[PDB]
Design a binder for this molecule. Sequence first.
Ligand SMILES: *[C@@H]1O[C@H](CO)[C@@H](O[C@@H]2O[C@H](CO)[C@@H](O)[C@H](O)[C@H]2NC(C)=O)[C@H](O)[C@H]1NC(C)=O
Ligand SMILES: *[C@@H]1O[C@H](CO)[C@@H](O[C@@H]2O[C@H](CO)[C@@H](O)[C@H](O)[C@H]2NC(C)=O)[C@H](O)[C@H]1NC(C)=O
Ligand code: A1IBQ
Ligand code: NAG
Ligand code: K
Ligand code: K
Length: 498
Amino acid sequence: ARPCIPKSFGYSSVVCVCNATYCDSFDPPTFPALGTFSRYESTRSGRRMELSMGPIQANHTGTGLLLTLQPEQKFQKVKGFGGAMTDAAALNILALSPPAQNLLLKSYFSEEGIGYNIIRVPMASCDFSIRTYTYADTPDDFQLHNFSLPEEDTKLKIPLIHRALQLAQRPVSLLASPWTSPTWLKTNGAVNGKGSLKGQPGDIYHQTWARYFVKFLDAYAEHKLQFWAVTAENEPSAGLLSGYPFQCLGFTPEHQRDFIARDLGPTLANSTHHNVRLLMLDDQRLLLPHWAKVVLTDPEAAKYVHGIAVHWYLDFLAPAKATLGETHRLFPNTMLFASEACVGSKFWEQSVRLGSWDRGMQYSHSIITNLLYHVVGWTDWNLALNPEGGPNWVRNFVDSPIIVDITKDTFYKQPMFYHLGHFSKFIPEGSQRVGLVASQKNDLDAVALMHPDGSAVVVVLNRSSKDVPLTIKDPAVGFLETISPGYSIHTYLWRRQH
Ligand SMILES: *[C@@H]1O[C@H](CO)[C@@H](O[C@@H]2O[C@H](CO)[C@@H](O)[C@H](O)[C@H]2NC(C)=O)[C@H](O)[C@H]1NC(C)=O
Ligand SMILES: *[C@@H]1O[C@H](CO)[C@@H](O[C@@H]2O[C@H](CO)[C@@H](O)[C@H](O)[C@H]2NC(C)=O)[C@H](O)[C@H]1NC(C)=O
Ligand SMILES: N[C@H](CNS(=O)(=O)c1cc(F)cc(F)c1)c1ccccc1
Ligand SMILES: *[C@@H]1O[C@H](CO)[C@@H](O)[C@H](O)[C@H]1NC(C)=O
Ligand SMILES: [K+]
Ligand SMILES: [K+]
């Protein structure tokens, strides 16, 4: 429909430039003809989700790499893909002109964009906030009569969420996570630093905190927003650390176990919001499987926990098989969900690297890894940031798929945007991961899924410099002869006749 307008900022690839009169966009989605496949390609050299079609062929000869679809080897069903409506994201989006705001939101949420269907919503302030507040700052208010949503919610986040939902054809799911409680519920009396809820699970402090989640859901429901899930705490491990720089609330896994079993589980189940799912952990994967063992081996906690939320700090190395793999083996009926991912957080790297193909490849490699380890969804962090990677009240700046430049009423779509969209656009909710078997050792990363309507999608990432010829075999349908160029990502789509 409208192609990328590329701009280089001296990094390895280009951004796509959007403004009040122009943004790259797709035509309304259509599937290729039976017997044809669609291929969307992005490359370091500058191609951005460009479409080409090819024939599905009856026959294949050769000793080149073959990836054979295993349509009957079924794994997890996918919840979806999206990102976080932080205060910083909201401020950045709303600092654009109305036309550019609309083109940014369409980029993420419409079928002319990449079809996000998840939005994560902080419960009050976090580091990606310019004001520190909770919804109940008036002290000793244990019945929460003074609980209320400030303008950060009612003027900024809620209206943008309504606008996202209007632009989406896919149903959008909301996920809520708190960073800190009111300080008068905390041992240290501050939003940050080392501190936990006062007292012990089952008591007034813990019951008040549980009731705050219900007040929050009630307040958003008055604004005609309902939540798919909440997490028990954003990064509960952080509040155990001396000097933790921003909003946190410390839980050991035992503390979270007991809080869920005695307070949060019962409180949510007793509310009009009982259909909201509760996700535990909401933290980095090296805490698994230990955290899952501690919480889910207690049947009184386990009965309230729908899933395990994991964060991906893509700047840092950690094992996947020993964390996600082992957790799935021990608790196969408790879904894994990636609730936050970010890059650019190392102080010594530029927070925002406009046009970094490497950071794009980190996103897609992470997503593939997540999907191959049974994770049902993937949620980016801030939907949009400024060129500094903020605002952020502790200067904890990071990168984002969309960077807003208010002085030019412009925004830039990063390689990360397109790497995420290779998945989000083409993997509807309810899609199921299926097997994909390589005939020989190779340097490609790939994942296959089946849509609810039976159609196939395969994403292929090449992080190498070498162009790799390959063939995809769908045993029911035939062969897709293709190529995976060096530093490329491809999504393949086709209809399946039986
Ligand atoms: C928004 O960006 C577009 C795309 O770069 C600008 O339109 C271009 O303007 C230059 C200079 O006049 C022309 O050479 C291009 O042909 C234009 N491209 C298109 C696709 O129209 C546009 O001026 C910018 N809008 C605002 C309000 O700044
Ligand atoms: C379970 O839910 C009910 C709501 O149906 C709660 O009952 C309310 O409690 C408040 C005081 O806390 C009263 O002012 C309301 O009039 C009550 N409403 C109803 C309909 O009874 C009850 O407190 C909840 N119990 C929990 C969370 O343990
Ligand atoms: N062909 C393999 C990758 N195989 S895979 O696609 O099943 C995969 C498995 C993961 F656990 C994570 C991924 F992201 C991808 C390779 C690629 C690149 C260098 C060495 C080996
Ligand atoms: C495919 O292979 C079979 C068996 O040799 C052959 O009869 C057929 O013509 C080949 N070509 C096509 C296009 O089906
Ligand atoms: K208040
Ligand atoms: K940085």
